[PDB]
Paper text:
Here, we employed cryo-electron microscopy (cryo-EM) and electrophysiological voltage clamp approaches to investigate the molecular mechanism for fast inactivation of the sodium channel NaVEh from the coccolithophore Emiliania huxleyi. The sodium channel NaVEh from Emiliania huxleyi is composed of a N-terminal helix (N-helix), 6 transmembrane segments (S1-S6) and a C-terminal EF-hand like domain (EF-L) with a total of 542 amino acid residues, suggesting the channel is formed in a homotetrameric fashion. The NaVEh structure is assembled by four identical subunits in domain-swapped organization. Each subunit is composed of a voltage-sensing domain (VSD, S1-S4) and a pore module (PM, S5-S6).
To investigate the molecular mechanism underlying fast inactivation of NaVEh independent of the IFM-motif, we purified a homogeneous sample of NaVEh in detergents, and performed cryo-EM single-particle analysis of the purified sample, yielding a final reconstruction map at an overall resolution of 2.8 Å. The excellent density map allowed accurate de novo model building of the region W69-D358. Strikingly, a strong tubular density of ~26 Å in length was observed half-embedded in the intracellular activation gate of NaVEh. The VSD of NaVEh was resolved in an activated conformation, similar to other NaV channel structures. The van der Waals diameter for the activation gate of NaVEh is ~8 Å, wider than the size of hydrated Na+ (7.2 Å), indicating that the gate of NaVEh is fully open. Sequence analysis shows that the first two helical-turns of the N-helix are composed of hydrophobic or small side-chain residues followed by five consecutive positively charged residues of Arg9-Arg13 (Arg-cluster). In particular, the first two helical-turns are embedded inside the open activation gate without clashing with the gate. Furthermore, we noticed that the outer mouth of the activation gate is rich in negatively charged residues; therefore, the Arg-cluster can form multiple electrostatic interactions with the negatively charged residues on the four S6 helices. However, the N-helix embedded inside the activation gate buries a total surface of 1688-Å2, almost 2-fold greater than the IFM-motif.
Numbering used by the authors:
A (entry chain A), C (entry chain B), D (entry chain D), E (entry chain C): 69 to 358
B (entry chain E): 2 to 17
Write the structure that this text describes.
């Protein structure tokens, strides 16, 4: 073992040092938040501030990592392997960022998504605060119980996605669909004006969405587009005015079809399946709470 | 919130 | 009674053979999903791939069905009648699809909805995996308990649908409704300009929907249109900006009518009735879980 | 007592007679539903059908009421006063409808809302079926417990309605509100073009709604308009894109005002208060269930 | 200290006097509501009515405060410090309003937000009615338990806000974005017309919102705009048609990016985190109820 390992390790496990590292984690997260709030642009105004602040924070986190490993004989396989691994990863990326800032573009412009991993340093705060840790451990021990109902709900969503691609993937392909009125029957016009040509019972409504598509291509053009449409319907977002109603009204006497499609999907998936997923989730969490 | 209620019941009744 | 049926039956009931059939079921479902994702068009690009893949899967499922029935003396009334029946149905339709692919269009172009039954083969996976089976059996033994509250909610929805057809089925029939504003009263204009004609207190807003209708014809034109509108309101989808608010502000001084209509519907049906339906559902399911 | 009262009363209490009256109630409700589905128009096509059908149903319900009262010595104060009263009311209105159909317009054209009371005859079915009765009695014994949390939620909604009328009742009164963009700071234009006049940092977006109003007049023009807006926000309907966001982005630098307004309202009312109302409701109902 | 304080104090604690003050509180709140309903304008029509009504109510509430303090020896530190403090604050502001109405504009035009504090006098009703008090005390003793899950949810929302500002803060900056067709592949046009120029596979859809912005600037232009966008998505408001879908379909072949962004956010935050927050809230409240 290292001749300086024991007292240094019990020093890093001290209450105050953990609280100080926590303060430093929260300050770094607030620094990233503030960068995105006051300086989000491409051509930044205060670039050196964020750069050297990230540099100083990465230096302090590297020193903290070294104090950590120095106290556990630099192994970190044996003691608290998960958080030590996550810390090693984030500080390794931070050192990569230091090198990138100083002496060149070590990484290709492609994988900057890894530079974006600074935001996830805040997850290290969950280890120190016993309440957030309690919440995330309950969540983790609750998710496998959810897995089954989740797989059932996804199976049904893919069934409905196949059905939707088969049925509606060409609704409004011309860019327009026709809906038929009840004009003469209701009172708005007399039957003679229709036969003469003064009024009509069909309206050639247009089908373009605000994304430039047609109704069918965007909402059910492919299987993943349809699965996404059914996710948006599962969360209840504009499922009628944008998704359902153009389909329901496009077909003049076959309105039972799309109506039953969307009503059955909503009932089954939304009500029953989402409530069962959430119910088993909360059940698992109250299990772990007690 | 039925999910919450059911979990609460199960926990209490099981304890009983 | 087959000579080696007992030995054969055991092989079918083996763990590995059931897992292999399950793998084959999931692969066929993924094949259908992939067909709809990479080749959804009418004029397909790789038509032979999907055709002969469905053919091979149908052949393997037919062989599995024959191994099944050969092990139960080909009766299938006495042992596991429900799943055996469902399997017989889906493989019969698959054999119909094989015949359709090879030697002619046996079925009229009308009932292709039965060729679409391939997507529902995945339901056979629920029998083999004990967790999904555990979920669907709880759901099935929970639904009859829901029946009562569901019938109450539907009774109230049909009441509101009759009321809505009687009241609003002609709202905006001209295509336009007038709304009145407090311009002189609020400060936007002086009372003299109104009497002279410079300003007005009414705006002839148009009532056409994005479906080509008028507000009344589409949302409450008939009883089933109104019942569908009330379903969309029960799920909370654009109930105000699309459904309620044009009615509420069509009336000059009797805005209490539509306001009370939609507020009472939302409170009663949405909050109370949906939460009672879901509550008895989850209660029944937790009953079966324990 | 009446010399024929006892056996007639125990005959009306018979299982089969109650089931037959229930069948007749459901058939009358289906008749009204069908009238609204197949013949909703003002100038009806089959008017005699609905008229004489309502007549026959009213006659049968009157005969049922007379058999009822004849069995309870025509008192109906003592025995089952609530349902007897409701039945007497609905059949009295039905007899009014018979008279109206035969020998003149007894009622002014104003109160037809009482002819619309046919739809509520179906509520009499709840007395005969022991499950629906079990649901509505639990609901009735649950509502007083809800009263307190409901009054708290309404108090908070009226507070927010006063605040909203004071703040936003004139947002966009000109019909247009100005919003400001970071065009020069972002890169879309250079600062010189702004000072010269080629680009700008303000866009005069228009504030008219699809009802013809301005944002302020419609959503918070008065206290009841504001209370209705806050109801629509409490149910989650377009609270951001229609209600919140024009207010939030109308303010140049004080966007914290409307943001905190709507965020605080949503959090408090929606999440906490709606979940507490529904929780005490379901708690009271599970109390009565057991 | 005072000679007759002992009897004056027990008089102010009387049932009837508390009920009378409660009636007076509710009447004042109804007076403010009625002012905003019947006279919301800037140039009011009945200004003296509201002014002198607020004056009389403030006088009665001041007399009530003096009777209160006279009964507790004018200390109010010792006995019921919280409600006494709130009452002192609101009546102090009311006396400020009396002075403002009579002898000048004591306060700058800036902080009228404090004159708006009349609406919050109704909170004093919660002390007298034991049911509303029972609800708000449970809420107060439930909120600290929520604090942890709330902080976790906010941490995740800020993570997603940083990610969103980095990714989408420039989506549609030109005001238009391009979405790509599958026209030749589907059947709507033949490949030759595209190469000749008769048809195209891209649509230059415009990106301006109804706020005058572009999609990126408004929804994720800064970190607080993005955090607000993610709040609107957390409540389920137009998260797809307004927020998600333009991003998802802006990308030609990398639609997995925005799809996974919004789907992961919705699942995690909406379903899991909101249900856990509300579950611990209701759990704490049922704890205090029993």
């Amino acid at each position: 073992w290292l001749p300086h390992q024991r007292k240094v390790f019990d020093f890093y496990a001290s209450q105050g040092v953990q609280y100080f590292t926590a303060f430093l984690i929260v300050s770094n997260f607030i620094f990233n938040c503030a960068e995105k709030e006051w300086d989000p642009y491409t051509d930044q105004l205060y670039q050196g501030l964020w750069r050297w602040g990230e540099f100083a924070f990465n230096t302090m986190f590297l020193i903290e990592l070294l104090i950590n490993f120095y106290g556990i004989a630099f192994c970190f396989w044996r003691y608290n392997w998960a958080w030590n691994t996550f810390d090693l990863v984030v500080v390794a990326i931070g050192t990569l960022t230091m090198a990138e800032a100083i002496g060149g573009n070590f990484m290709p412009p492609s994988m900057a998504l890894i530079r974006n991993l600074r935001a996830f340093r805040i997850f290290r705060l969950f280890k120190r605060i016993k309440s957030l840790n309690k919440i995330i451990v309950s969540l983790g021990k609750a998710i496998p119980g959810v897995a089954n109902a989740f797989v059932i709900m996804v199976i049904i969503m893919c069934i409905y996605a196949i059905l939707g691609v088969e049925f509606y993937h060409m609704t409004g392909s011309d860019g327009t669909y026709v809906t038929y009125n009840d004009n003469v029957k209701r009172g708005l016009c007399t039957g003679d004006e229709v036969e003469l040509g003064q009024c009509s019972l069909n309206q050639t409504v247009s089908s373009e969405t605000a994304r430039g598509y047609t109704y069918g291509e965007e909402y059910y053009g492919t299987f993943f587009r349809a699965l996404y449409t059914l996710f948006q319907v599962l969360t209840g977002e504009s499922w009628s005015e944008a998704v359902a109603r153009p389909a329901v009204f496009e077909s003049h006497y076959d309105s039972f079809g799309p109506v039953l499609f969307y009503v059955s999907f909503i009932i089954i998936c939304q009500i029953v399946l989402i409530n069962v997923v959430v119910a088993v989730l909360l059940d698992k969490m109250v299990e772990e709470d007690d | 919130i039925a999910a919450i209620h059911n979990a609460r019941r199960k926990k209490r009744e099981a304890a009983a």
